[PDB]
């Protein structure tokens, strides 16, 4: 469940919260796959 | 006292000399065929692990206190709080780990006894040793409880001075 | 040696069954028990088959040597030359089996003391004598004995 | 639910402009993990091995054998809920503050949920950012009415039992006395079996001008490199600068096994779901995060101040 | 098997999480070759081959040609079989220990088989790492309390008929009389033919801090590594540092034609079949490795120590 | 035979502990393929 | 007989009633003992009681 998911629909604010959080830790995940040093 | 001992703001810092601590592994060489026993002990007299224990029978049940050598029945290996029950090495099997002792400038290869206390102390204090104690390491002090690595291999047949 | 390895030319005769297990190779005991406590100690000289006492001191671990007395600890019973590792038996455990002794003067119910060698010798006491001494090979003699402890 | 919130749609459609936190260039990928809570503690288990003789030599028979003991250690962690609200239209009221190009009173600075939303979002992970850097809440340059916080919270500078060092107010301008407490500093650092590890620079942009200067045709920051790569097992050293700081250094491991940040998976600004309305245009929101979770081992962090008086 | 042993199971599932050894990095991928040999010894032949006289010249009728000559060598390499027991919670019992996040009594420092096995596991690797880089088994910082080895059973840091170099304690802090050792130590090197390979440098702490120090814009790094340069035909050098040596430098070359390691394919940790039960929820288990195989050329190993009393 | 496989059902302990060694070597022939110097 | 080994099943069920009685005893007096005198109990734990003590 993540909001960078076209299809993804969420039923509740608790699924929305959920899809939120993990929207933030795959955008974490594509920073530091982009991230150069 | 107690073995375990609480929550830490942060974590405590090779592979050698980890072992010193006072929960550490009593048994610095281990075997199966080792008799180990179960004992009451005495919740508020004396904490005996790591320490030479005695027999006491008392009126409800046989209890283990803090012992000399002369009245010597074992080592206490363990203990677990919850219960109070303390684990004891019967003398008649051989040991060889880590036990408290009250001097904190011990040599390596030293005669060593066990004084009222459950405690190693030099042999040279004049009481007439009767179990044969030899120390394998130098006392180190953790930060106040000192310990020591020992050998202990039955009783002495005449004692000594 | 314990087997001193020699290539021979002929077949020995071995069919008698008896006076056929005192020899110095039988290594271990004549009855032995699963619960019988054995370590493995690095040992100095040959202590097979004689009391042991171990000797502590680039510094290194204690080992074993030859001995009695009160410094006695084990008796070695097995021995490794390639490790150079010896199997010892302590103190604290009965043993049953054929030692190394001093002389022939060892006989039947008698009370025995490891020396200062590690050898068995007549009178603490260590053992008691269950046969006469044996001369396997020139002064090497094997007496059977049951080790209790000291007195 | 898309159907019914619309302050729902709004957030899940503009989620993807906030941008992303400056504090993970300061952590390595693995060094970073979340937890589920909100408030509350948690406690960690660290499980350690150590040998307690030389090992057994497997030769004929043999029943006593060296043996390997185990040791635990327990950190707490505090974890805490902040909340911030703010005002914006309604969503039946857009169309009457629909402007040429542009929504919102410029009179009465109001603004579209979404537009809000994002501007708050943007403000607080500011603000998180400060707190996971400095360890401390505040909302003013010299960095006075701190937000009381609770113990087991610290940031890299406050976190307990590292190595400080302090730099004397008479030698505030000689690199040479800063490079010698940095040495000090670096000497007592204690990183154990763990040393092969790359390490982490912050500085404030003072330090960062000293350093450029050139070395009493080499600079202070090459020298600073080579010291720390001495004992980094050669391995990589990075540099950053943060205006957050105020004459301070910091010296430290990108090892996970030494410094582990484990944030609450709602740390990030998230939206509640309570809204005030009322019969005017104007309604109100709220946003919530979570703070704490920096763990660090002893002597593995060096933080340097260089007193100005 | 895996229907009837669970522990078995445990070590097949969990075996992936042991990091691997850190003195892979000391040897090229060519120099090891495993070997099938748990205790003993285990004999060696290398062969070679050598001109009699210069080549016959073929011209008209000849039958008296030149002749080619072969040489054989024998080296005898001791392996050691040494074994560790841990304690653990039993598989019928860990469901009475499964506490919330984590599994296991910390009041009474047991753990899982799992868990128990990769720390023992990863314990025993640190001791074979020392083991091979230095040739000594040993538990305490002192280095004392040694296991006494077999013959044949040589590390990289004792290996005999080697070049060993000396720095006085008085010169202990004289980066230009430890460079002179190495430089004489890099002279009396004898490679022959095998000249043109990647070469390795092994540096304790305190040398690797010496090292960055400026060349008495140039660093004592940069020349050691030029002259190594110099003598290896240019080819690459490599600084690594540790924390299991102690004021030594160890210079040798990555080829497999001077120094190989044939180290046993049981070295690394495994279980063994027996696991003692009884009555409560306590089992023992027994780990086993393997010790030795290092060979090397005569004269290939530079091994400078500096004294520090 | 290596445990890597999902395939490999090993029988006894004898050829657990030969998939422990070849899981070991290939595991070496890995890290140095991946180490870059 | 002659020397009181029993097989398996018996000497569990006997072994089994043998607890239970232990069991109830315990339910009933909050005190574990073997003896009549009710002498030499077994010392437990806090916040362990039965219906008499």
Known sequence: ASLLDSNFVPINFTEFVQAISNTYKQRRIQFYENLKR | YSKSMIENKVFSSCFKSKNERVDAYSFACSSYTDKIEEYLYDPANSFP????????????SIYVEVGADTDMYGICVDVCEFSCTAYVLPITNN???????????????????????????????????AINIYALSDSFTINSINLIKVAIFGNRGLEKT | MKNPQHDASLLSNSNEFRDKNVEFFASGGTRTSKFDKLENHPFLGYPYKRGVKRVIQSHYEPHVEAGGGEDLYGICIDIDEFSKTATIVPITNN??????AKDSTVKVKDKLIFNKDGALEKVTINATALTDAKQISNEVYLVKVAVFGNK | ??????????????????????????????????VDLQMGYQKTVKWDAFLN??????????????????????????????????????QTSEKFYTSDSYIGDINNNLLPFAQA?????????????????????????????QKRLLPNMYGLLNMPEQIKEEVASGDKDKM?????????????????????????????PATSLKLVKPYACEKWEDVLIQTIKAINNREDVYIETSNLLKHKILIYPLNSELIKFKPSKYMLPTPNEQVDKDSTDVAHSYIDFVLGGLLATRKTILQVNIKQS
């Open chain 4, 1 to 34: 639910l898309f159907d019914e919130n619309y302050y729902a749609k709004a957030v899940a459609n503009i989620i993807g402009e906030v941008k992303d936190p400056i504090m993970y260039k300061w952590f390595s990928p693995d060094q970073i993990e979340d």
């Open chain 2, 49 to 60: 692990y790591k320490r030479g224990v005695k027999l006491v029978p008392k009126e409800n």
């Open chain 4, 176 to 204: 040479d006395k800063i490079f010698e407490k940095i040495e000090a500093g670096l000497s007592k650092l204690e990183l154990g079996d763990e040393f092969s590890t790359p390490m982490m620079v912050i500085v404030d």
């Open chain 4, 117 to 145: 939303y994002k501007l708050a979002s943007s403000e607080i992970i500011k603000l998180i950012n400060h707190f996971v850097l400095t360890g401390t809440v505040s909302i003013q340059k010299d960095g006075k009415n």
């Open chain 4, 53 to 90: 003789a030389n090992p057994t030599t497997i030769a004929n028979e043999v029943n006593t054998i060296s043996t390997i003991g185990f040791s635990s250690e327990v950190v707490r962690l505090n974890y805490l809920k902040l909340q911030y609200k703010f005002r914006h239209l309604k």
């Open chain 2, 95 to 129: 040991f060889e780990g880590y036990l408290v002792t009250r001097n904190p400038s011990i040599k390596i290869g030293e005669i060593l006894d066990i004084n009222n206390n459950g405690v190693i102390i030099k042999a040279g204090g004049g009481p007439p040793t």
């Open chain 3, 95 to 100: 043993f049953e089996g054929y030692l190394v």
